[PDB]
Design a protein around this ligand. Structure first.
Ligand SMILES: *[C@@](O)(C(=O)NC1CC1)[C@H](C[C@@H]1CCCNC1=O)NC(=O)[C@H](CC1CCCCC1)NC(=O)c1cc2ccccc2o1
Length: 220
């Protein structure tokens, strides 16, 4: 695998979005991964509707603004046969009745791949597939007010890796000594947060300390 990957440079990633006050991080992570795979398949980058997921993926197990899983969202898209565009089904940060319309569907998926719980497996997937849906620990004040640099998770891999985000690549900044690698992560808290909406997560830190707990991506 190459030592640096950035799928943004290949046109895989839509501009950073803002989920507002709605527990819909899972929907933004899912739309980001599906946007990447749809682009790889078709060469067209089309922003997809998180509101569609929030309103309609209840039968697959999600609970709208009260949380959900990216895998359940991929399953909804597969069962539903489509997903509306962001433009056709805009985001409101509150759950409404399902308004899906197949006429405005712009995306599809045929299931999903769960990546094994290993840093090397995640790195291979990122290097070869595209942006990858993952869950990270976003609870600390140091993350809420993150602006620049490599972010180091305090409490290793504790049992609330609870925030769905999108890994769009990885890299390193070799300084004095240690390479100091990082995952490039797209968040859903707007352009104003972090590095234009992105965060560099510390990478290859130590075994049992990661970001590979719930990595997956849709098949198209
Ligand atoms: C996101 O981190 C998020 O939207 N955060 C912004 C509000 C600040 C949510 C937050 C979560 C949900 C809202 C209520 N309180 C919360 O802490 N996190 C999730 O949705 C989380 C993501 C998954 C991703 C894959 C690994 C496990 C975690 N999912 C849930 O919290 C969840 C999932 C689920 C499935 C069925 C029924 C309920 C349910 O909740």
């Amino acid at each position: 695998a190459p030592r640096s990957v950035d799928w943004r440079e290949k046109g895989y990633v839509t501009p950073v979005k803002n989920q507002g006050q709605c527990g819909s991080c899972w929907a933004f992570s899912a739309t980001g991964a599906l946007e990447g795979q749809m682009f790889r398949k078709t060469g067209r980058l089309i922003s997809l509707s998180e509101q569609n997921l929030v309103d309609c993926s209840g039968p697959q197990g999600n609970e709208g603004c009260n949380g959900g899983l990216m895998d359940y969202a991929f399953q909804y898209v597969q069962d539903n046969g489509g997903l509306d565009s962001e433009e056709s089904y805009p985001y409101e940060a509150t759950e409404e009745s399902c308004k899906y319309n197949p006429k405005y569907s712009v995306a599809n998926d045929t299931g999903f791949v769960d990546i094994p719980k290993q840093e090397k497996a995640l790195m291979k997937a990122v290097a070869t597939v595209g942006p990858i849906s993952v869950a990270i620990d976003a609870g600390h004040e140091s993350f809420l007010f993150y602006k620049e640099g490599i972010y180091f998770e305090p409490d290793c891999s504790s049992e609330d890796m609870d925030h769905g985000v999108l890994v769009v690549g990885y890299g390193f900044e070799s300084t004095e000594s240690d390479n100091n690698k990082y995952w490039l992560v797209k968040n859903s808290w707007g352009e104003e947060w972090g590095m234009g909406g992105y965060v560099k997560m510390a990478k290859d830190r130590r075994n049992h300390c990661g970001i590979a707990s719930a990595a997956s991506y849709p098949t198209v």
